[PDB]
């Protein structure tokens, strides 16, 4: 290789937080073969990407402007403001104008075309052949009541992104030699057996078992388990799933390797324990912790695969099946129907998930007939993209690489606006791929390299998992490495800054927990020991500036040490604030970040992202619900950072105005708080209007996701009336709509009023609107549960959102469901709010 060529890889390992050149936890070479496989997709995308547009990463959309934003234009005229050091004139522009065209109405409007419209304060450019109506920064300014401000400077040089020179009819059988574990002790001794499953997409094709034996630290069976399934009938992607019950341990082994070879030989597999169903149960990875983990020893010595029209009455039976939801389980009668009428079923794209579930993958002939099916894919290829539908073929139920490829094909048609909407959920879906190299993993690689913004979030989503998941770190590390070798040195330098900063601060956060008590208050000497520590970093240690990971436009600078503090709260997070490093920023307002170690933030990532998806859904139907899905990024193990929404206050704090007598509660208080922070009465009604939309948006969203029973303490409001929920780490109430909220709506329980009439109207509007996307939400939820929780009932915890979205019912009933829910909160008032307290003391 080379002296400095290996110094490149030690930079790569530092950003990844894992060494992909390590081979100490492999029993084959799939991971290294995947490093080599991804060189091509990388070099292709890099080689065909526009240098100019890659440097500026214009964030842009082809969707129509919503109805709720053409109301803020009674005149077909939008206001932009071009800047230059001191002075800065304003310019009349029509929504359909272009970056180039408004430069035509600036220079010629004055009485050399190699300048650019960058945004004031950020690294966000208005460029490329798009209308300004169709730029995200512009839609954002219109949405808030802000005015588009812009500075004129030289385009950033493409030179800075340049990339370095790169680098049988025999039945199947397995011998169970035995198991071994250095130490087991609990208290009393039991018996133990090994269960072997041939598995394919959460379908057990076959299952044999050992005789049981006593659970000493070594147990030897020496037994052949003859299976019924024949070798030729083994499908690519099938897993030998070895499990130990007395269900304490599990491990998996792909029966057909990444070169289509039948798996053969002597394996010692180090196994995962079960924490006192989910995506960790599917992994081909073995436990790296070889000193403590349980190990199984096996032997393979077994290569391969090298007219008439329906009666109208069955069609109805078949259509009914196809209509049902992604969780509605299929009977044997239903599957056989689907399969017998394959070709009719292929005419309905929505039937696809249900159809490929009806396939007997445990049979060679039928899989082949299934490949004949996928070969005449005219209707699918021509169908309009359905993200819900496409996602379903990427979940844990589908292990066939061709099935999964027809789904990835549909994704290729997404523009970058929609990729960012689904990116986190597509990164989690790499967990369900049988092989490390996959159409999906490559699709992300390709989309990330093509767009600096997708690239940026693909970095942190990958790194979040690598840091806190032994089950999938090696796979994701290989994928990240591939990204980093093609993202270009501007982005590598950027990440290196970001990784350095957060490593310095997490250090400070862990070092501060320990000097404070397990829990009480915040010491005089502890705010002493926070300021001192950050003064030492600030000088010769911290970058002059780093990219804010949750908002990669914004460049944070030097710390505002006076405003930083440890938080009198759960597990001593740091409230930090930074100066903005861009001197053309039009405000002296700091960037606020919380650093927390203790909670599990991947869950918050996931919930906030589904919340961003609901906003986008409501966009399809002219519905704005003023949600504040604030930034939130997991960076490492049980730890990460959070955006501080400026001017926000906990609802429980507004109730603790005085005393707050261990849980005193009072209807009228919220409304008084709103008038104090609103210098004109005019802005006060703007706040109540904002509170009715926001309260409604967070009510509907929260009912649907089953996270609505919350303390006042985890709900906030801005000075401008924008309500929002926080801290999604996990008698009853479907959601929070307490008497304090209702007095803002001019209604003190058991009445109706103009502002409350809006609230109900908006709620049912929002609720029926999410139901036009029932299959999407069910599948995102089901996946959320599987890749981002503890262990969970693959039927029962998902089955909440069915009943929440009132599946199978007509629209009138559905409204009547939700409207009962509102009146459950108003029939209970404070009962549950007060109840959180009763346990405590
Ligand atoms: C005297 S004190 O300085 O200690 N004071 C006490 C009362 N605090 C109220 C808050 C608690 C809080 N927790 C979180 C959080 C905690 C853990 C996990 C989380 N996931 N998402 C948020 C979040 N995120 C917060 N946000 C997010 C949105 O932007 C405003 C700050 C706030 S604000 C402020 C601090």
Swiss-Prot record:
It is found in: Cytoplasm; Cell membrane. GO terms for molecular function: 1-phosphatidylinositol-3-kinase activity; 1-phosphatidylinositol-4,5-bisphosphate 3-kinase activity; 1-phosphatidylinositol-4-phosphate 3-kinase activity; ATP binding; ephrin receptor binding; identical protein binding; protein kinase activity; protein serine kinase activity. Signal peptide: none annotated. The modification Phosphothreonine is found at residue 774. Pathway: Phospholipid metabolism; phosphatidylinositol phosphate biosynthesis. It is linked to Immunodeficiency 97 with autoinflammation: An autosomal recessive disorder with variable features. Affected individuals have childhood-onset antibody defects, cytopenias, and T lymphocytic pneumonitis and colitis. Some patients may have features of hemophagocytic lymphohistiocytosis. This is Phosphatidylinositol 4,5-bisphosphate 3-kinase catalytic subunit gamma isoform.
């Amino acid at each position: 290789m080379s002296e400095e060529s290996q110094a490149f890889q030690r930079q790569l390992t530092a950003l990844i937080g894992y060494d992909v050149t390590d081979v100490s936890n492999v029993h084959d070479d799939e991971l290294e073969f995947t490093r080599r496989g991804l060189v091509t997709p990388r070099m292709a995308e890099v080689a065909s990407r526009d240098p100019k547009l890659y440097a500026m990463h214009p964030w842009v959309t082809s969707k129509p402007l919503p109805e709720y934003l053409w109301k803020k234009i009674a005149n077909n005229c939008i206001f932009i403001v071009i800047h230059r050091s001191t002075t800065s004139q304003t310019i009349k522009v029509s929504p359909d104008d272009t970056p180039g065209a408004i430069l035509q109405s600036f220079f010629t409007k004055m009485a050399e075309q190699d300048f650019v419209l960058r945004v004031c304060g950020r690294d966000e450019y208005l460029v490329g052949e798009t209308p300004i109506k169709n730029f995200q920064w512009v839609r954002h300014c219109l949405k808030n009541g802000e005015e588009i401000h812009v500075v004129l400077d030289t385009p950033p040089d493409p030179a800075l992104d340049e990339v370095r020179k790169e680098e049988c009819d025999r039945k199947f059988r397995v011998k169970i030699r035995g198991i071994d574990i250095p130490v087991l002790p609990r208290n009393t001794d039991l018996t133990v057996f090994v269960e072997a499953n041939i598995q394919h997409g959460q379908q057990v094709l076959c299952q044999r078992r050992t005789s049981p034996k006593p659970f000493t630290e070594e147990v030897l069976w020496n037994v052949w388990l003859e299976f019924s399934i024949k070798i030729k009938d083994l499908p690519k992607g099938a897993l030998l799933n070895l499990q130990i019950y007395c269900l304490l341990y599990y491990v998996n082994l792909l029966l057909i390797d990444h070169r289509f070879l039948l798996r053969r030989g002597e394996y010692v597999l180090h196994m995962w324990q079960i924490s006192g169903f989910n995506a960790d149960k599917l992994t081909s990875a073995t436990n790296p912790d070889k000193e403590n983990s349980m190990s199984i020893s096996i032997l393979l010595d077994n290569h391969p695969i090298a007219r008439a029209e329906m009666p109208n009455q069955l069609r109805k039976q078949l259509e009914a099946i196809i209509a049902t939801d992604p969780l509605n389980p299929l009977t044997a009668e239903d599957k056989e129907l689907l399969w017998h009428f394959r070709y009719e079923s292929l005419k309905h794209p929505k039937a696809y998930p249900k159809l490929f579930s009806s396939v007997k993958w445990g049979q060679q002939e039928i899989v082949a007939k299934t490949y004949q099916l996928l070969a005449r894919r005219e209707v699918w290829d021509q169908s309009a993209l359905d993200v819900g539908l496409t996602m379903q073929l990427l979940d844990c139920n589908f292990s066939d690489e061709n099935v999964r490829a027809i789904a990835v094909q549909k994704l290729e048609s997404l523009e970058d606006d929609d990729v960012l909407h689904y990116l986190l959920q597509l990164v989690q879906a790499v967990k369900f791929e049988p092989y490390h190299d996959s159409a999906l993993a490559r699709f992300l690689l390709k989309r990330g390299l093509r767009n600096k913004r997708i690239g940026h979030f693909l970095f942190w989503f990958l790194r979040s998992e690598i840091a806190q998941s032994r089950h999938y770190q090696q796979r994701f590390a290989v994928i990240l490495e591939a990204y980093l070798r093609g993202c270009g040195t501007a982005m590598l330098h950027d990440f290196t800054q970001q990784v350095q900063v957060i490593e310095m601060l997490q250090k400070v956060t862990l070092d501060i927990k320990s000097l404070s008590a397990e829990k009480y208050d915040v010491s005089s000497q502890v705010i002493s020991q926070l300021k001192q520590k950050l003064e030492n970093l600030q000088n010769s240690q911290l970058p002059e500036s780093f990219r804010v990971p949750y908002d990669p436009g914004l460049k944070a600078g030097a710390l505002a040490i006076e405003k930083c503090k440890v938080m009198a709260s759960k597990k001593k997070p740091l409230w930090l604030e930074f100066k903005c490093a861009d001197p053309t920023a039009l405000s002296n307002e700091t960037i606020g970040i919380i650093f927390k170690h203790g909670d599990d933030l991947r869950q918050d990532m996931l919930i906030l992202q589904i919340l961003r998806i609901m906003e986008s859904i409501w966009e399809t139907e002219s519905l704005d619900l003023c949600l504040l899905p604030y930034g939130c990024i997991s960076t490492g193990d049980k730890i990460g950072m959070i955006e501080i929404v400026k001017d926000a206050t906990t609802i429980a704090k507004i109730q603790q105005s005085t005393v707050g007598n261990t849980g005193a509660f009072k209807d009228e208080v919220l409304n008084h708080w709103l008038k104090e922070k609103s210098p004109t009465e005019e802005k006060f009604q703007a706040a109540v209007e904002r509170f009715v939309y926001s309260c409604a948006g967070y009510c509907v969203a929260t009912f649907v996701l089953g996270i609505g029973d919350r303390h006042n303490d985890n709900i906030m409001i801005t000075e401008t009336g924008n309500l929002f929920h926080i801290d999604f780490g996990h008698e009853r109430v479907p959601f929070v709509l307490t008497p304090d909220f209702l007095f803002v709506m001019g209604t003190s329980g058991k009445k109706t009023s103009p502002h409350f009439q809006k609230f109900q109207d908006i709620c049912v509007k929002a609720y029926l609107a999410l139901r036009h996307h029932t299959n999407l939400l069910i599948i995102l939820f089901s996946m959320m549960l599987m890749t981002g929780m503890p262990q969970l009932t693959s039927k029962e915890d998902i089955e909440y959102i069915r009943d929440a979205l009132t599946v199978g019912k007509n629209e009138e009933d559905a409204k009547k469901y939700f409207l009962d829910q509102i009146e459950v909160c108003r029939d209970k008032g404070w009962t549950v709010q007060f109840n959180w307290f009763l346990h405590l003391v």
